[PDB]
């Protein structure tokens, strides 16, 4: 009976593909062809933050657009003041291998996970002024690749066991499990309305999950290799994914099909980080060729280039007000651009 | 208008002093990535260097501190977290030489994949041909033939530079150096002048694996320092 179910699955996939093809009556090549290009987005580094001994692998911007958290493989979580390059905090980690960090929307807490499969949450606003670990969420059987604070007392973590999880901080036990990915889930992005979230995995597939009810609401394919980054469009009705195939793709949730492709012939390095601008017109992507690119999301062209990193760019972020863009690479240096 | 930014600069200076103290220790120790598979004996080597001085094992030889990371409780798709070990000073690859079954081909393929990884082209590999007593017993028994899985072994001879332990059968040393040369062919196929392989013949009763690792790391650091001077 397994074979008949396989034919049922393949014919259902064929029907879905046919419906997607029918739903596409045009393409963005001629829809936005009458839009003036943004020209050249020339950006220069304003601040350079130093102090990490080993490579910086992830970062997250604050809600106030002032404070930063950066995680380095030496075992350090450093909170910087972007305006004055002042190190506000420096937290040592129990495990040197950290692969993600998140900053709470209220700014009270900071999270980090890694090869230890444990998400450690530290309370910054403590009574005695010394930062100590407040929670250790455990339960993933694979490396924790990305965490994003839904709010206080709730967090979403994607792991290397091909699963995502929504936890409860004070109880310490995960409340919801999102399964369906056949590969390593690499990135997360919370929707602006805080009701859905997209996760791209190491199977050339991304999935939109409903956090409240807890199952794969939608799925999207099109990439050629492992997806390494994902982020929601500011409108909340689209997202962008970068992969190891040296291409970026923009998907729309309502269209449920591939929408835009940002690629170049002379780019053969995978994308490690993806982020949007405040208006959503500029899609910023970090690459393995040691420099970041800035595409016009509506035109699919290189509107800007950020160079100055001596190693692969690993993390990339844009402020809530859009005023500055921070890039962290493997040369232990984090840069601010505006 | 120095009212509070003085306080944040004092906090910055304290943080910088703490970071300098931490850096004085971070690069004074060598981090090692232990790699292997099932029935390879890497856990026995771990307990060996732990009793006598992800999972972490700290040991110390000649007043030099070594941190060894044994990946555990992870899936079998290592194409992603292995990039976390691009700055490791050495990858200790342990392989059971008596598992030809024919598990030696898989070990060779993983060794080739590690050697050819673009994020590990600068990290040297210390090779541990573990379980030499089992290989000797298997060769002396004669029930299993190496040429069954590696036909070219039928046309292989002992290298001239071989230094067998006295009292060893020519057959067992032939097989031992054949496995070593099988690994060394992949080692020398690519990656010239930037990382090297350090094969060794270890076993469970062996007791100088720690000194072997120390010597190999010493050689790696010396070669790196000489290369920085454009002198080697």
């Amino acid at each position, epitope marked *: 009976e397994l074979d008949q179910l396989r034919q049922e699955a393949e014919q259902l*996939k064929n029907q879905i*593909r046919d419906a997607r093809k029918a739903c596409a009556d045009a393409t963005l090549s001629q829809i936005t062809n009458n839009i003036d290009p943004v020209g050249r987005i020339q950006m220069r580094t304003r601040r350079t933050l130093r102090g990490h001994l080993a490579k910086i692998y992830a970062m997250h911007w604050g809600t106030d657009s002032r404070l930063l958290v950066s995680a380095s493989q030496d075992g350090k979580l450093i909170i910087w003041d972007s305006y004055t390059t002042n190190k506000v905090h420096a937290i040592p980690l129990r495990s040197s291998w950290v692969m993600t960090c998140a900053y709470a929307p209220s700014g009270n807490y900071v999270a980090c996970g890694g090869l230890d499969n444990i998400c450690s949450i530290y309370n910054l606003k403590t009574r005695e002024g010394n930062v100590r670990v407040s929670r250790e969420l455990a339960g993933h059987t694979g490396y924790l690749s990305c965490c994003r604070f839904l709010d206080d007392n709730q967090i979403v973590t994607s792991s290397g066991d*091909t699963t995502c999880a929504l936890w409860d901080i004070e109880t310490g036990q995960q409340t919801t499990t999102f399964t369906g990915h*056949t*590969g390593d889930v690499m990135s997360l992005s919370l929707a602006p309305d805080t009701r859905l979230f997209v996760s791209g995995a*190491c*199977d*050339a597939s991304a999935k939109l999950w409903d956090v409240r009810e807890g199952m794969c609401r939608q799925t999207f*394919t*099109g990439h*050629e*290799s*492992d997806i390494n980054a994902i982020c929601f469009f500011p409108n909340g009705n689209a997202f962008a994914t970068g992969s*190891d*195939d*040296a291409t970026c793709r923009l998907f729309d949730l309502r269209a449920d099909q591939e929408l835009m492709t940002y690629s170049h012939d002379n780019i*053969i390095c*995978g994308i490690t980080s993806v982020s949007f601008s405040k208006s959503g017109r500029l899609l910023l992507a970090g690459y393995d060729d040691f420099n970041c690119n800035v595409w016009d999301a509506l035109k699919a062209d290189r509107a800007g280039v950020l160079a100055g990193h001596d190693n692969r760019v690993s993390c990339l972020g844009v402020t809530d007000d859009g005023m500055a863009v921070a890039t962290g690479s493997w040369d232990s240096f984090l840069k601010i651009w505006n | 208008q120095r009212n509070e930014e003085k306080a944040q600069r004092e906090a910055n200076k304290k943080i910088e002093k703490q970071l300098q103290k931490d850096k004085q220790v971070y690069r004074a120790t060598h981090r090692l990535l232990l790699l292997g598979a099932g029935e390879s004996g890497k856990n026995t080597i771990v307990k060996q260097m732990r009793i006598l001085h992800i999972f972490e094992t700290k040991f110390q030889v000649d007043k030099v501190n070594f941190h060894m990371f044994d990946v555990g409780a992870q*899936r*079998d*798709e*290592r*194409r992603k977290w*292995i990039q976390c070990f691009n700055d490791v000073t050495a990858i200790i690859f342990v392989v059971a030489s008596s598992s030809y079954t*024919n598990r030696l*081909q*898989a070990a060779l*393929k993983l060794f080739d*994949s590690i050697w*050819n*990884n*673009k994020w590990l082209r600068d990290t040297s590999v210390i090779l541990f041909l573990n379980k030499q007593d089992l290989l000797a017993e298997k060769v002396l028994a004669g029930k299993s033939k190496i040429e069954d*899985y*590696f*036909p*070219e072994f039928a046309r292989y001879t002992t290298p001239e530079d071989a230094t067998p332990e006295p009292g060893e059968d020519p057959r067992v040393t032939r097989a031992k150096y054949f496995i070593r040369d099988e690994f060394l062919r992949i080692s020398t196929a*690519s990656g010239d002048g930037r990382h090297y392989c350090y094969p060794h013949f270890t076993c469970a009763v062996d007791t100088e694996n720690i000194r072997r690792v120390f010597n190999d790391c010493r050689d790696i650091i010396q070669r790196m320092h000489l290369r920085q001077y454009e002198l080697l």
Partner: nanobody, 126 residues
């Protein structure tokens, strides 16, 4: 949608020959590395052979060296495995696999248990 479909299996007497075809869709074929793996009774995934982008560099496992031939045609987006002089221990499910990264020499996790870019495989029994 990455897709790899295998065909050409079946039952053959010992000493026979077979041809296994592997059709790829959803991605460019010439920008990465192909390979053939197999899974036999006595559960375990073993690497059989591999071929690079252009097809100049080909490598075989010791057991089938001198017995199997591998080829790739980027024009037709296909891979071929020619099997000569079959032996009783060659009965297995053959998977046409490929490691993900384009333009790379390393090739990870092809023989993994739950690989994503591996085909459904075809039965070869003798």
């Amino acid at each position: 949608q990455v897709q790899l479909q295998e065909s050409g299996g079946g039952l053959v007497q010992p000493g026979g020959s077979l041809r296994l075809s592997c059709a790829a869709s959803g991605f460019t074929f010439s920008n990465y590395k192909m390979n053939w793996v197999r899974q036999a009774p006595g559960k375990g995934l073993e690497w059989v052979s591999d071929i690079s982008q252009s097809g100049a560099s080909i490598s075989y496992t010791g057991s089938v060296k001198g017995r199997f031939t591998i080829s790739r045609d980027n024009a037709k987006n296909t891979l071929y495995l020619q099997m000569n002089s079959l032996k009783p221990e060659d009965t297995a499910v053959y998977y046409c696999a490929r490691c993900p990264a384009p333009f790379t020499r390393d090739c990870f996790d092809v023989t993994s248990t739950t690989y994503a870019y591996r085909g459904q495989g075809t039965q070869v029994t003798v």
